[PDB]
Design a protein around this ligand. Structure first.
Ligand SMILES: NC(=O)C1=CN([C@@H]2O[C@H](COP(=O)(O)OP(=O)(O)OC[C@H]3O[C@@H](n4cnc5c(N)ncnc54)[C@H](O)[C@@H]3O)[C@@H](O)[C@H]2O)C=CC1
Ligand SMILES: NC(=O)C1=CN([C@@H]2O[C@H](COP(=O)(O)OP(=O)(O)OC[C@H]3O[C@@H](n4cnc5c(N)ncnc54)[C@H](O)[C@@H]3O)[C@@H](O)[C@H]2O)C=CC1
Ligand SMILES: NC(=O)C1=CN([C@@H]2O[C@H](COP(=O)(O)OP(=O)(O)OC[C@H]3O[C@@H](n4cnc5c(N)ncnc54)[C@H](O)[C@@H]3O)[C@@H](O)[C@H]2O)C=CC1
Ligand SMILES: NC(=O)C1=CN([C@@H]2O[C@H](COP(=O)(O)OP(=O)(O)OC[C@H]3O[C@@H](n4cnc5c(N)ncnc54)[C@H](O)[C@@H]3O)[C@@H](O)[C@H]2O)C=CC1
Ligand SMILES: C[C@@H](O)c1ccccc1
Ligand SMILES: C[C@@H](O)c1ccccc1
Ligand SMILES: C[C@@H](O)c1ccccc1
Ligand SMILES: C[C@@H](O)c1ccccc1
Ligand SMILES: [Mg+2]
Ligand SMILES: [Mg+2]
Lengths: 251, 251, 251, 251
């Protein structure tokens, strides 16, 4: 209760899975939230399921769309006042090795997972710096930002990029006294309706050779670390990686 | 409020600095707490300053004392019921390079910082496993578990040891379904009364080449990450490292 | 002597600095080498300075040019026989924070440093797999793939991407028995004619707060780790990072 | 050939497995070598199998024996002149979880794997600093210094300790211009006569979920990275970790 009082958050890809749980817990903790998705059927349903428009709204946006990022911040500040918190959560995956990644697949995935995170982080710094907001940018950067997977080549590139680009941003903001922190969150495998629709994936993901806890996580597992990072509780944390993975990377 | 309802925690070195703030926030969040120190003058004063005996008590113990560790768990369970949470926070430092570390200094520091953490972790697993407690062992493992410092040789050894031993314990507990998580917390430099008594240390620590944020942290910065790790909010986090360092390790 | 007997190597950006030293030592150790640069004035001079055309040749190529990558492998195999070794060394830097990185700067740097390395790695796997060559892909991935720098935002993104994408490729090649290894090399600061032309850079780079050894490296420092990685001496090394940095990342 | 001309090396645990291969390649490259083992039957046989006494000798020593370390350096300098190179390779393992590690097991393993490496490193710095030798200390610090194993708790503690203590030593030596480098080598699983005597271990170790290359390494895989680190080829490498693991830690 009240851990995000006063905060105004944008969460990209906030209508389902991890993003939706982040939104839910943020609203529970007193934040105002703008969620996005590139679609609208999903997004408008999503917001009302969490709360009332004074708490949470939807804005249609593809995170790879540079110009839209500006539309999104403007819409958020007009609904709720100056943005304090950005969660760059939107992402896609391609199930290909590096060897077999088409150039089109490469470019598409980097547009969302890398360019989108760059656009959001760059704009977030510009919009949030020097306002006494206790501003926090939280970039979703995966267990696949620490370890490779033979069938996630482009995804691995994007997540490693986000991991280290976020440190650069953290340092500049710290050195310049901007009152903006930048950190990454690295989920292991999490169970969502989308995973449930992939036959065998959860089981495959729950083998002890993958996730030592022998099961995968839930969306709220990622929501709670994001609450910590958005809150002023984490005012000395910047430039670091927060892993919530059931032990995946510990072995 | 209520984030640690029902929890019963031991915090070693809990009478001052980071340990005391961990204790304070744990009690605020509903945990019962036993704090320790090798002394008693410090420890008894400390507990009453946080709360009443039904909330927090003191037990005299040197974490290097293997037999005492057993006394400590027994005293905690008799005061508050079965222990769910252990914070291995007690530690010492020697201001010596590897080159100049005496063997006596080496052994003394390893006894507290390494053996003590081993004794606590081993006993904690044995006492906490298989009770449905949502048990959590939180080992204090430093920025000096990631990077070296030329004048902290033995300290660096101990912190690197804790970092990886904790992963071993996390994995075994996960694989065996023990309902015990093990994680490490890695503070950067934190401002305490002890640091205040070391002329020039905070300033030295606040240079941008050391801490990018240009200042050092406060004890509550470490308390809040410990609340997250002790709580069931972090039920999917095991075997990982949580860094709160003002950017120190990001550059 | 003879440590790369029989090997056929492509080195991108091989006409100056680190690339030229890699080429020089590779030829000394018995490899045949094709060096590249996006220019030709630099490239043709470079090759003759190292050896005769039966040892080393130049091919004009911008590593961001996908179609050219195919031209480059074909020219190398026609000069020297099937390629066994690829060093993805070409790279550029932008001296900008994330905050101030223009989109054009972002795209240009990613085209060379990320897309170029992807194109080379993908093609290298396809061309080298399953030929008994003891094939090795060596991706230049920087100290800036481990730590951030506030004024190298895009560069940091690219180097973190290369670091982890390389692990993906390593794993797929290992799992599929391709006889291709993939590793990254992470130079600290190295002294070259280009650094010499940047007033104050070497000195700035030699401060103990940057490079503990108190001086920067030389091109051969990177050449020698590349010889090891190209040779069959390193037949069990894949998916890992080889840092040669004067202590930069150790503190 | 000649890559270690002039060097004088001590290799602890140099009579079998990885240590013996390190010794063999060191002698091949022109170094003079003193190997150790706590036994003598093994050690005297070992040296003659590699070369003549002017190339390689044996000295009986348990690396946990502090006073003996001094005897060992003196015997080496009297045979071969001032020591330039130290490989802290002796180590033992206990097949126990943290939970089940007896205190006696803990102390015994730390005495060899941690205290022994401390004693060697401390003495090596003192004996080697400031002599223009191009001195190099190479500490064997395992894949189990990066990841945990549920059944190697004490071993994991020791290897994490060595990993970070070595960075401390590297930094002090660099900052003080000692002409001593300190680095760690991290083998994955390697096939030796001892592994061959453990039924099922190699197979278990070769599963793709353990070692992606699908087989384990050979002793020379570790010897060759040690040659690089002992040689002046690696004069800019200090404070870093060199992993040769078949991909184990990349996934
Ligand atoms: N679910 C899992 O098991 C894992 C998820 N992750 C990461 O967690 C993050 C969030 O995951 P989920 O919310 O559960 O995703 P999800 O798998 O449940 O659904 C995909 C989500 O991505 C967003 N998205 C995709 N393309 C987009 C675009 N062009 N513009 C805006 N939004 C877009 C959508 O809003 C959608 O909610 C992602 O970045 C993903 O990379 C990482 C590891 C595992
Ligand atoms: N204060 C700082 O700047 C930093 C602290 N740390 C780590 O944080 C942890 C806690 O720090 P503080 O509480 O602020 O310590 P402190 O510096 O304020 O005071 C030392 C504390 O260590 C405990 N302690 C020492 N030897 C002990 C023994 N033999 N038995 C039981 N307890 C013992 C005492 O209770 C005392 O409260 C330590 O493990 C330390 O290594 C790490 C980096 C920086
Ligand atoms: N010199 C230094 O201090 C450091 C260098 N590095 C990295 O080391 C690698 C090699 O460095 P140097 O050879 O010394 O570079 P250099 O600084 O001496 O010169 C730049 C080199 O990059 C190559 N290059 C740039 N754009 C290219 C393109 N579009 N196509 C083909 N080639 C291109 C050129 O061949 C040129 O030789 C680079 O990837 C760089 O990122 C990393 C840290 C420090
Ligand atoms: N063989 C393998 O699969 C792996 C080995 N390692 C590490 O590699 C290093 C070397 O391995 P190997 O030479 O193959 O060992 P080994 O397994 O072949 O034989 C044990 C070696 O340890 C030395 N040793 C043990 N206790 C000693 C003492 N008290 N004093 C002096 N020497 C002692 C002995 O000389 C003996 O040669 C060790 O530190 C080990 O921790 C790490 C991972 C895997
Ligand atoms: C790593 C996670 O994002 C994932 C990617 C592709 C398919 C399933 C899961
Ligand atoms: C790293 C921290 O624990 C410290 C150690 C010695 C002196 C000051 C601070
Ligand atoms: C990190 C190195 O590539 C560099 C980049 C920009 C300017 C100088 C040096
Ligand atoms: C990790 C390696 O040193 C090992 C330890 C115990 C048993 C087998 C192998
Ligand atoms: Mg792993
Ligand atoms: Mg650093």
């Amino acid at each position: 209760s009240n851990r995000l009082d006063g905060k105004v958050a944008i969460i990209t890809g906030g209508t389902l899975g991890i993003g939706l749980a982040i939104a839910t817990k943020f609203v529970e903790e007193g934040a105002k939230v703008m969620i996005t998705d590139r679609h609208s059927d999903v997004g408008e349903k999503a917001a009302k399921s969490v709360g009332t428009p004074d708490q949470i709204q939807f804005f249609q946006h593809d995170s790879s769309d540079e110009d839209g990022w500006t539309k999104l911040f403007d819409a958020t500040e007009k609904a709720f006042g100056p943005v304090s918190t950005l969660v760059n959560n939107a992402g896609i995956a391609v199930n290909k090795s590096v060897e077999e990644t088409t150039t089109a697949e490469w470019r598409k995935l980097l547009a969302v997972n890398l360019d989108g995170v760059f656009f959001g982080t760059r704009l977030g710094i510009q919009r949030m710096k020097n306002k006494g907001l206790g501003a926090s940018i939280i970039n979703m950067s995966s267990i696949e930002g620490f370890v490779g997977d033979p069938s996630l080549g482009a995804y691995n590139a994007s997540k490693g990029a986000v991991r280290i680009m976020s440190k650069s941003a953290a340092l500049d903001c710290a050195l310049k006294d901007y009152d903006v922190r930048v950190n990454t969150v690295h989920p292991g495998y999490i169970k969502t309706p989308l995973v449930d629709d992939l036959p065998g994936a959860e089981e495959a993901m729950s083998q002890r050779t993958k996730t030592p806890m022998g099961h995968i996580g839930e969306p709220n597992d990622i929501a709670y670390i994001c609450v910590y990072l958005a809150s002023n509780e984490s005012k000395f944390a910047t430039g670091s990686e927060f892993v919530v993975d059931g032990g995946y990377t510990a072995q």
